[PDB]
């Protein structure tokens, strides 16, 4: 991992005001903080500036594998395992990642609670809506499967909700 792109993990702009200690008593943090700058920031940074070249001198790049897409359980004949083998393993990858991206959506909501102070009850409203929509979607995708979760049961969950809504729309029609 290199670094976070803002569109992925957006962060607020930082506005720290200029210090205004009106008293004539000197601020200790200026002296003490300079010590950490002169004692921990630099000498470690001095080593840091050394390590970078050694990492850069002998260089090697490891890549991020990508997975093609293949027909899913909507297109597999009954008990045709070889064609089904792709779908379930492919499906397991699909679910596996989608579990994390719920965290990432929760990462923005959790962090916004803290950094933003007491107005977290008001500031992070967008993150909530950013979060509520998916979770409703997420449980619609991989909830009520049990320890032996599978695409067929994952699909069957869609079948029971669709005929619950399709009928309901006809009922409400």
């Amino acid at each position: 991992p290199d670094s976070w792109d803002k569109d992925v993990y957006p962060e607020p702009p930082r506005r720290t005001p200029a210090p205004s200690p009106q008293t004539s008593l000197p601020n200790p943090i200026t002296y003490l903080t300079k010590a950490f700058d002169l004692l921990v920031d630099r000498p470690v940074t001095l080593v840091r500036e050394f390590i970078e070249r050694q990492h850069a001198k002998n260089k090697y790049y490891y890549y991020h594998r990508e997975f093609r897409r293949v027909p899913d359980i909507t297109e597999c004949q009954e008990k045709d395992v070889l064609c089904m083998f792709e779908a379930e393993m492919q499906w397991r990858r699909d679910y596996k990642v989608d579990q994390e991206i719920v965290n990432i959506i929760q990462e923005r909501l959790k962090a916004c609670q803290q950094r933003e102070g007491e107005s977290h009850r008001q500031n992070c409203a967008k993150e909530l809506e950013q979060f509520t929509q998916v979770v409703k979607a997420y449980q619609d995708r991989y909830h009520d499967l049990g320890a032996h979760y599978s695409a067929r049961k994952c699909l069957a969950k869609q079948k029971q909700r669709m005929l619950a809504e399709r009928k309901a729309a006809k009922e409400a029609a």
Binding site: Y9, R15, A18, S20, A111
Partner: protein
């Protein structure tokens, strides 16, 4: 000597070590180290933006 030897090995070394961990491995991940934002008071100037907060309204000048 006891204070100085232990200081480098057990105070200055870990604090150096902690710096690198946060400074290049923990911060680089999103939403890793959070800090409650600084308080804002009337008539304070910003640095990233350069803007200045309005002062407060005209107090009634009570017996104070």
């Amino acid at each position: 000597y006891r204070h100085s030897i232990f200081a480098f090995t057990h105070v200055l070394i870990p604090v150096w070590i902690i710096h690198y961990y946060l400074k290049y491995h923990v911060t680089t991940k999103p939403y890793t180290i959070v800090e409650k934002k600084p308080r804002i008071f009337p008539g304070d100037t910003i640095l990233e933006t350069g803007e200045v907060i309005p002062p407060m309204k005209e107090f009634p000048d009570q017996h104070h």
